Design a protein around this nucleic acid. Structure first.
Lengths: 283, 263
DNA sequence: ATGCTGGTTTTTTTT
DNA sequence: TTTTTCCAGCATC
């Protein structure tokens, strides 16, 4: 239920969001937004970003060939235990590997068997992807030639690649939305590592092949012109039909089901225990 | 001209329009148009009354800068704008220390040692921190010339507390906002608390406690010494003036850096 | 439909 | 000669 705004002023109007363009004033209820995508020629006010962050909404600045910038709130969860579970899973090598296995395995339509050697799955994924690219290139009619990322080549982005990248930007925005709205951290990456938003990519990879590739190929099969926008429409139709944002939330919760384990008391750490917070102690 | 702390510089902008102007930041306010060099800019702090442009965030994202939507004087923290170039080595170090009981205990003892010499105990140190808080309370109750510390508040009822209690709580909120700002501006997590574990802002409280006894308590007691009308606002004003007179953000960032050094 | 004014409705060694 | 000069709700009739 995300919303894309370009060439408009976004401010807080009447306790909600107001987008001022040449058409006048459009008011949008912030209840179901998830992501507010700001295209080029857009200015937003401190109050609008404050309200969106407070309502557990993320702001994603997408561009005309640029980087990715995400505005991050504080989440809908009051004091997330989910984050403590994420940190414990990330910090323990065995649980870490288990989460990595989970993330790789969830990308296959037909579920896999239990006996399946590690680092083989990480290679099996690769053929799926490649065969999905080939499947939709044969289906639509658009030649593939591979993705624009490789080594030793700065081959120009063909339209399908550009559609892939735009839809990827939007999918990453939604991934960030669900991650920070459920109280997780984008920085605790399991497959992607080193960046404060790695987990976003970890989550988005689970739905790239299911939603992005068909939308991009179907958009380039008809257009080859103005894809960056029509891919957004096709991806919107595919996300609000499969109820992705809810599915993502479900996967984010169920993803950590292995190890162990109001709203203003507090706490106090002890060795494998905790004392009550907010009390005087000494003599 | 913009002040740096250790490495990159930072900027607080309020009551202005932020645009990109000539490969840099352009600030349109009542004073006109001001140029800020984006080259090596860690955090750009947006106060209320600032609206930004798609081009400005594009330029900031390309240069690896983060934006922090904060309240007036950074007493409140509202939102973080980050890009994909932001490194998470400090965050990984904090998490690794937090998840291992030995390193966890070591960092907790660091945090305790920063508020005082030392002693040698396990669960009495909590009582010693208690006694420190209480006798500092008593000191500033005497010097201010007022009632006692007490600290009797009800979360459900704001006005069901002492005037000094309300001032104390307001100042605590201000310190928590500034702590949250400095914590996430250096790339750490507010939820990875070593003391106060269990809250998503535990580390914020951990950091704010390091400066409560030096900034919050005297400000609250002296504000109640001024009057008992609008204490909540006066204490915040006096704390703002005392934070800008003591460069508390730089000290906070420096201590946060040294907190995970050599562990 | 026009001045104004405050920058957000707080608390985590309280019980 | 190629825009940006604080934003938004409160109080008043």
């Amino acid at each position: 239920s995300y919303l894309y705004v370009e060439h408009a002023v976004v401010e807080r109007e009447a306790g909600g969001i107001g987008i001022y363009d040449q058409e006048g004033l459009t008011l949008a209820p912030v209840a179901g937004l998830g992501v507010l995508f700001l295209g080029p020629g857009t200015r937003i006010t401190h109050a609008a970003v404050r309200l969106l962050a407070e309502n557990g909404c993320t702001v994603a600045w997408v561009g005309e060939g640029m980087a990715r910038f995400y505005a991050q709130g504080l989440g809908d969860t009051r004091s997330a235990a989910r984050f403590y579970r994420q940190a414990r899973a990330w910090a323990d090598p065995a649980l870490h590997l288990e989460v990595v296995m989970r993330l790789y395995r969830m990308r296959f339509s037909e579920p896999l068997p239990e006996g399946l050697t590690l680092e083989q799955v990480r290679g099996l994924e690769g053929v799926r992807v490649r065969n999905a690219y080939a499947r939709w290139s044969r289906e639509t009619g658009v030649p593939w030639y591979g993705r624009s990322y490789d080594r030793g080549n700065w081959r120009a982005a063909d339209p399908v690649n550009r559609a892939l990248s735009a839809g990827a930007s939007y999918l990453y925005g939604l991934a960030h939305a669900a991650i920070v709205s459920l109280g997780f951290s984008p920085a605790l990456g399991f497959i992607h590592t080193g960046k404060l938003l790695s987990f976003v990519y970890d989550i988005a990879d689970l739905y790239k092949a299911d939603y992005l590739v068909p939308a991009a190929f179907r958009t380039v099969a008809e257009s080859e012109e103005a894809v960056e926008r029509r891919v957004r429409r096709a991806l919107r139709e595919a996300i609000q039909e499969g109820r992705l944002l809810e599915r993502m939330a479900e996967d984010l919760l169920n993803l950590f089901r292995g190890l162990g384990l109001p709203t203003r008391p507090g706490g106090l750490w002890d060795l494998e225990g905790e004392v009550e917070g907010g009390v005087a102690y000494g003599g």
